[PDB]
Symmetry: C2
Subunit: 48 residues, 2 copies
């Protein structure tokens, strides 16, 4: 469970950034996205 709990925060975050980038086009914002994507994979991985 704890890990699934990280999973959902991570997915809720990648939504807020996703929306933010739907309007303002900042590179830094989008650099954060790819950090969470990398993240998200590592989560499911060890989730199994």
């Amino acid at each position: 469970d704890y890990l699934r709990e990280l999973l959902k925060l991570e997915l809720q975050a990648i939504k807020q950034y996703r929306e933010a980038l739907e309007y303002v086009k900042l590179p830094v914002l989008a650099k954060i996205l790819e950090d969470e994507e990398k993240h998200i994979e590592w989560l499911e991985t060890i989730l199994g």
Copy 2:
């Protein structure tokens, strides 16, 4: 505001990982922390 909204998700996340690492000592988990820390700084920065 939107940016402050990212700020709080990011800070709430670094709490869940912080706690998780308070019990299980996975390197990957801690690699995520430092991604969010890097993140957090970029947020406040552009927050001003």
